[PDB]
Ligand binder design. Structure first.
Ligand code: NAG
Ligand code: NAG
Ligand code: NAG
Ligand code: NAG
Ligand code: CA
Ligand code: NA
Length: 252
């Protein structure tokens, strides 16, 4: 059921909470009936991940468990996959795989040549240099390098070893992307983080081709600091100026 993105539905406000900037997500490999929510407020100087027991508890309570990571993250580009959080260690291009339910670092590895420290942030800033994400095919990193002139680089990653399995060099400047997400092996890039937001560029990893496109999506609360696709519920999770929102998508 994989296909090209053709539409993004109007976003639902799941929660109003937190600072202007952050991330929230569910695990796409969590089993039926498990919709724990993982929540990270801020883009620097925070090592605590909130765990809400379910999407209902997230929407209707302020009850959560607080998980202490071994290091603070940078940015809002974390992802949860098969029970681990993958995140960018502060002030580095290191990725950490941390197994949430055993409080164990399972792997650390540098992401070769990636910029960090607000070098190749998305346009919103916030130390968003390295964005990790999951689609139907597995785990990916979206970043940039000096050898690719600050243009977005995509790598498919091994979720256990953190080694790069394949890399694609796009020609789109990462600092000009508001955010980005991958659906079915295609990178979709937004035009900005404020005002009238749209997906306006797509890079297809299956063919190493790109195009400019125009798929609007509602910036509901004025500023978007996190936007990722989840293949389990086929939705975009966003952090929109202190609100946690969710968009359905339409694929061809
Ligand atoms: C909050 O969650 C904890 C852990 O699941 C639980 O022990 C506690 O009863 C919850 N609080 C309420 C008011 O339900
Ligand atoms: C998820 O982790 C379990 C072990 O906890 C493993 O058996 C399974 O293969 C993993 N799934 C994927 C898709 O990697
Ligand atoms: C990406 O670009 C870098 C810098 O030019 C180059 O070293 C590398 O081989 C490229 N990788 C691919 C898969 O094109
Ligand atoms: C997505 O669509 C389904 C129905 O197909 C609906 O149950 C769900 O609430 C929708 N989610 C959002 C965020 O609109
Ligand atoms: Ca993203
Ligand atoms: Na991410």
């Amino acid at each position: 059921a994989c296909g090209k993105l053709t539409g993004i539905s109007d976003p639902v406000t799941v929660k109003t909470s937190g600072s202007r900037f952050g991330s929230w997500m569910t695990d796409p490999l969590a089993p039926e009936g498990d919709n724990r929510v993982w929540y990270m407020d801020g883009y620097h100087n925070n090592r605590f991940v909130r765990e809400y027991k379910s999407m209902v508890d997230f929407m209707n309570t302020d009850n959560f468990t607080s998980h202490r990571l071994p290091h603070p993250w940078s940015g809002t580009g974390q992802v949860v996959y098969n029970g681990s959080i993958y995140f960018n260690k502060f002030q580095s291009h290191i990725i950490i795989r941390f197994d949430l339910k055993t409080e164990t670092i399972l792997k650390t590895r540098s992401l070769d040549y990636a910029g960090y420290n607000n070098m190749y942030h998305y346009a919103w800033g916030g130390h968003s240099d390295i964005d990790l994400m999951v689609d139907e095919n597995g785990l990916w990193a979206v970043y940039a390098t000096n050898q690719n002139a600050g243009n977005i680089v995509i790598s498919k990653l091994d979720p256990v070893s953190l080694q790069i399995l394949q890399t694609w060099n796009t020609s789109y400047p990462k600092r000009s992307a508001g955010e980005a997400f991958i659906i079915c092996g295609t990178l979709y890039v937004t035009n900005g983080y404020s005002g009238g937001t749209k997906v306006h560029y797509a890079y297809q990893t299956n063919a190493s081709t790109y195009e400019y496109i125009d798929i609007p999506f509602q910036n509901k609360y004025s500023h978007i600091s996190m936007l990722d696709y989840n293949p389990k519920d086929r939705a975009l999770y966003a952090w929109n100026n202190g609100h946690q929102t969710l968009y359905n998508v339409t694929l061809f």
